[PDB]
């Protein structure tokens, strides 16, 4: 399987696992997206803390808009637990999640670790190659 | 906000919280779906254990198919943690999740408790009423 990865992700643990899984990576500096699977499928990796921060600063919807305008089938992988992070009401997180997945129609898959994020990227890429 | 609930959910903790939130419920016996928000939006509540079981028995995709054929904008809320449940490889769960959200295009929102499931149903219903 072949995956294009944005330069900023190069030395991440995600890339390490993708390489262990035998994925062939092509590095590029992308204006949008972190991992490109096909001309239509792109993945944006976001830590739970960054998701919450983007909700606090009201920048999440602009981000999703940009992802959708660049790829017809974008996917967001939120990495890390969203529970236990105070300073923000649960409804603020829930509301944002519902908005992105149901309104914007962009899937928000949850990963517990960078290794799991890599496993998701791998299985999606494999299905793409077969498809 | 008004929500139609399937009879089998009547005495759940989800319904208890929806009532506390001031939601007006209409009970019906639905052939598909557990909570109906609009003519287009329906929600299927599934425990983590039942999701895993449906993957084991290969019945998940048939279930999603039926949800989609009944409602144009179906939503699945998986309640409970999917981690720590052996007898099934993580990739089996990940693969199923990716398939439903990306391939079938049905959002899979994750809830930690029946109370959280109710909070999601509530905020979605409210946005529907306003919309």
Domains and CATH numbers, chain B: 1-131 (3.40.50.10130)
Record the resolution, in angstroms.
1.8
Specify the pairing of strand B35-36 against strand B2-6: antiparallel
| Residues in the annotated binding site of B for Mn(2+) | 34, 44-45
CB contact (8 A) between residue A116 and residue B90: yes
Q: Say how many CA atoms lie within 13 Å of A74 toward its Cβ.
A: 20
CB-based contact A107:A76 (threshold 8 Å)? yes
The full length of chain A comes to: 131
Specify the pairing of strand A108-111 against strand B2-6: unpaired
B27: CB partners within 8 A, 6+ apart: B4, B5, B6, B7, B10
A63: CB partners within 8 A, 6+ apart: A44, A54
CB contact (8 A) between residue A123 and residue B97: no
Question: Is residue B119 exposed (0-12), middle (13-18) or buried (19+ Cβ within 10 Å)?
Answer: buried
Of B91, B110, B119, the CB nearest to A123: B91
Technique that determined the structure: X-ray
| Phi-psi domain of B111 (left: phi exceeds 0; alpha: psi -120 through 50; beta: other) | beta
| Residues in the annotated binding site of A | 34, 44-45
Of B83, B94, B109, the CB nearest to A101: B109
User: Residue B52 has what DSSP assignment?
Assistant: H
The full length of chain B comes to: 131
- Separation between Cα atoms, residue A76 and residue A69, nearest integer Å: 14
């Amino acid at each position: 399987v072949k995956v294009v990865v944005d330069s900023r992700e190069l030395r991440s643990e995600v890339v390490k696992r993708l390489k262990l899984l035998g994925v062939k990576l092509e590095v590029k500096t992308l204006d949008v997206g972190d991992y490109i699977i096909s001309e239509d499928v792109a993945i944006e990796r976001k830590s739970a803390n960054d998701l919450i921060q983007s909700i606090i600063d009201g920048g999440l919807f602009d981000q999703v808009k940009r992802l959708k305008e660049a790829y017809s089938r974008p996917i967001m992988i939120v990495e890390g637990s969203l529970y236990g992070i105070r300073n923000v009401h649960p409804n603020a997180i829930r509301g944002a999640i519902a908005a992105v997945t149901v309104d914007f129609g962009v899937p928000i898959i949850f990963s517990s670790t960078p290794e799991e994020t890599a496993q998701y990227i791998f299985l999606i890429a494999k299905r793409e190659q077969e498809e």
